Design a protein around this ligand. Sequence first.
Ligand SMILES: *[C@@H]1O[C@H](CO)[C@@H](O[C@@H]2O[C@H](CO)[C@@H](O)[C@H](O)[C@H]2NC(C)=O)[C@H](O)[C@H]1NC(C)=O
Ligand SMILES: *[C@@H]1O[C@H](CO[C@@H]2O[C@@H](C)[C@@H](O)[C@@H](O)[C@@H]2O)[C@@H](O)[C@H](O)[C@H]1NC(C)=O
Ligand SMILES: *[C@@H]1O[C@H](CO[C@@H]2O[C@@H](C)[C@@H](O)[C@@H](O)[C@@H]2O)[C@@H](O)[C@H](O)[C@H]1NC(C)=O
Ligand SMILES: *[C@@H]1O[C@H](CO)[C@@H](O)[C@H](O)[C@H]1NC(C)=O
Ligand SMILES: *[C@@H]1O[C@H](CO)[C@@H](O)[C@H](O)[C@H]1NC(C)=O
Ligand SMILES: *[C@@H]1O[C@H](CO)[C@@H](O)[C@H](O)[C@H]1NC(C)=O
Ligand SMILES: OC[C@H]1O[C@@H](O)[C@@H](O)[C@@H](O)[C@@H]1O
Ligand SMILES: [Ca+2]
Length: 862
Amino acid sequence: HHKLSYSLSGSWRVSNGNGSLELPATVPGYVHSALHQHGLIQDPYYRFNDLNYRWISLDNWTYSTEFKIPFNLSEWQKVKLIFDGVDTVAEILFNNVTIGKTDNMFTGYSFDITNVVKDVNSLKLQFRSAVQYAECQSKAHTSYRVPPECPPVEQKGECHVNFIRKAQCSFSWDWGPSFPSQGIWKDVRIEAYNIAHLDYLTFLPVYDNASQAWNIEIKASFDVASSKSVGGQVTVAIPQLKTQQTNDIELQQEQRIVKLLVKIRKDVAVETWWPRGHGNQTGYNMTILFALDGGLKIEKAAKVYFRTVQLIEEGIKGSPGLSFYFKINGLPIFLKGSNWIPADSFQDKVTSDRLQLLFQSVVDANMNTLRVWGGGIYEQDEFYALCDELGIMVWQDFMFASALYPTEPGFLASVRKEVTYQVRRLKSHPSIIIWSGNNENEVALSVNWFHVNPRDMKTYIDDYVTLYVKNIRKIVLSEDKSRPFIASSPTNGMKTMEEGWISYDPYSIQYGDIHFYNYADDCWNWKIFPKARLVSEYGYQSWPSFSTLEKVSSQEDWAYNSRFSLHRQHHEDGNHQMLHQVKMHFKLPQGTDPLRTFKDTIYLTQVMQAQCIKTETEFYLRSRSEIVDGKGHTMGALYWQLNDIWQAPSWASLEYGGKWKMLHYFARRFFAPLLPVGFEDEGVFYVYGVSDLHKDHHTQLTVRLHHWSSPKPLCSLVNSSIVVKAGEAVVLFQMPVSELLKRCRGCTRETCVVSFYFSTDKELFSPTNYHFLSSLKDAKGLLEANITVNISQKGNVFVFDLETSAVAPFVWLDVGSIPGRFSDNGFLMIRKKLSVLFYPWKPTSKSELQQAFSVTSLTDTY
Ligand SMILES: *[C@@H]1O[C@H](CO)[C@@H](O[C@@H]2O[C@H](CO)[C@@H](O)[C@H](O)[C@H]2NC(C)=O)[C@H](O)[C@H]1NC(C)=O
Ligand SMILES: *[C@@H]1O[C@H](CO[C@@H]2O[C@@H](C)[C@@H](O)[C@@H](O)[C@@H]2O)[C@@H](O)[C@H](O)[C@H]1NC(C)=O
Ligand SMILES: *[C@@H]1O[C@H](CO[C@@H]2O[C@@H](C)[C@@H](O)[C@@H](O)[C@@H]2O)[C@@H](O)[C@H](O)[C@H]1NC(C)=O
Ligand SMILES: *[C@@H]1O[C@H](CO)[C@@H](O)[C@H](O)[C@H]1NC(C)=O
Ligand SMILES: *[C@@H]1O[C@H](CO)[C@@H](O)[C@H](O)[C@H]1NC(C)=O
Ligand SMILES: *[C@@H]1O[C@H](CO)[C@@H](O)[C@H](O)[C@H]1NC(C)=O
Ligand SMILES: OC[C@H]1O[C@@H](O)[C@@H](O)[C@@H](O)[C@@H]1O
Ligand SMILES: [Ca+2]
């Protein structure tokens, strides 16, 4: 009864520095989006507008609004103004009275406006240019410099992003643009109360081996209006588990924290939480009822998920070092996923509809893990909600990435609020399986990316410990000891700690995880890849579809080396690298039409990306159970990256807008719960069988060869005694190349292609798989395909019946910007007739698809 909370989200007014501009602005919202929505600027993502609209990021904007309160002043002791997120530096004026300042995008603020609030009020937020601010903070840090000062030239970005607690990629990255915007990107609320006010509430399910039963630790901080003590009770009820607990409590201006510990009856069983593809995601409805003196009842609800995670760094016989794998509820699980970056340069445009759709694409690719990369943001509440319900584990970096940061007291003060705020918000989610201090910053000091004098190294080493160990780690562990914590990624884990938090070789394959990138060598030669304990990053680059680029480019920009394409590339020599990797096995497009060449080149990059990553991932999958050369037991593969922040060349598999690249279509295939991987080593074709199932599978293997001329098998080697251990990977077929060619007379490395598959279980998904005995640019007898398509509607899905003139490699179906994706794409089409489906994301007709359709095979490129 004695509580009142209503939102201030809605239509505000935004003005520029000299007041020349004043327009309506929505909250949550940024300036750019308010200017774009009001039609005062083009789409910032259009061509070179990241350079033209730089004036927006450098000016100082102001959000203002005048409101009448829906409650009488004399009926409430205290009134507070709450911000769930302000981006970033702003002075908050309430009735021409400065009530507070902000400087950290990733923490909420609360302000006591009891003495300032009137019947009608005016709330202004006077933001300051994030760019100009980050520079003054840099100039004020005169004791020494904190690298990197400015980003690479090919990123077209701003300097000193590490001096502001703001999304680190907001000043540009090697796949994203520089749009350091300003605005209120989270809800804003007025809250008046009497007696008490719940500042925050947090809980943490834990399993006590010393008790063999589950427990829920709860912590709630209150703010008491009066100096007098306050009594009451609190009741925690979980009916589904027949649990109910009531405890006395008291609050005071100094003793304002409540700590509870609910034990769950051992008589009742508790269903635990599991990642997608390894169990259920069952949770439990829970209510926490506070009942205080004077009839003030504060109730909060939330779903409770029970789950134990362990980062096991144990010993391995014959392999020096320490393992690195996760045990969920006691079972080792192989991480299968990618790295998550912000889905847009402006978070107010990352609607709920977009998120669920993006999470459907992640689910539909058989992924079970997502790494919230430390250069983006602590994602919105619905992001981690979708992870919990869908069963996606979350590797959660803190928002410090690829940079050294200052230890100035004001900065740490700001970082402490952030970390305390975010840990308390996120630690109740089961999805999160590990805390991670930063991205690649342990490597930056170990290798010295920023070329510091060995004299001043001591300084930066201390700042690394101060920030990630003395502060971030100190806070995480004071709030949560249920999840592992690592200071950085890639790291050596326990070994890193043993060496003072900066290992001698953080890229070690014998400890911790690694990031691997290679643009010069042949990506088919799996011997280049490291047989590490866990791979948390790895990726090749490709261009998005022409359909995506068309929306932010002109007619003259559609060339592979145009001013627009080179400007959109934010990676050093990314275009040359991609083509250098295409030439490795394919033929650069040889056409007359510059537009067709441009499209066929994109197509090829996506072919190079898909096959490269498919080669690399499959290597990590089969390396999960073996030790070779003192290396092995790989228990995780998260490729870089998942999504795009804008239309540009990246490592992603989801183009900005959600459209699946060809890589993502391969992801659903090489992340299946059971698949065979094919490869050869010094002239011997091997076939491993990877398993994610919980019990051993008895199935059959069939190996076949095909001449490009006709799709009929010159070979059908079948083995009926095939058993794949649970969750393991083992070789199941071994035969020399020249011998295998003699078994399939009329075949050459350069004329035939290998095919193999498991026996479908109807209730188990196991796709086919192929292997190339030679580069397709050296292939012979490869008749150019001539694919005929017939579209037909069947319910809310569309059918695509195909017929090809011969074996078509890398068949690519594209229906332009029509939102949706196919059931399979980029496949090696051996059969003459194949049928795939199309799942619309918005209403579409038979004619819309018919008109924008276009099929492509490899031979069409030259
Ligand atoms: C736990 O609480 C949720 C509410 O968040 C319940 O889900 C609602 O169920 C009703 C009817 O069963 C639906 O009309 C609502 O649309 C549901 N809401 C949501 C958000 O899903 C859920 O049933 C509860 N579970 C139990 C076991 O009581
Ligand atoms: C607003 O108030 C000014 C003095 O108050 C000081 O400055 C303002 C901007 C706030 O930061 C407040 O916290 C400070 O104490 C006056 O000089 C000015 O004339 C006033 N203007 C109006 C329109 O009331
Ligand atoms: C490509 O194919 C076109 C369509 O061919 C028709 O469908 C296939 C499946 C065969 O059954 C064929 O007999 C049909 O006529 C042809 O119209 C076209 O000429 C072919 N060649 C080229 C260069 O387009
Ligand atoms: C405000 O500053 C902008 C800077 O781009 C300038 O174009 C505009 O004319 C200025 N308006 C006034 C009234 O000074
Ligand atoms: C923004 O504010 C800062 C601090 O008041 C000031 O130094 C800077 O000149 C302002 N920028 C503009 C474009 O007015
Ligand atoms: C998981 O959910 C399924 C429903 O599809 C149910 O049959 C099964 O018993 C559940 N598992 C556990 C351990 O409760
Ligand atoms: O620096 C190597 C890679 O590291 C990742 O963490 C991201 O920063 C990527 O953008 C980058 O390509
Ligand atoms: Ca390592």
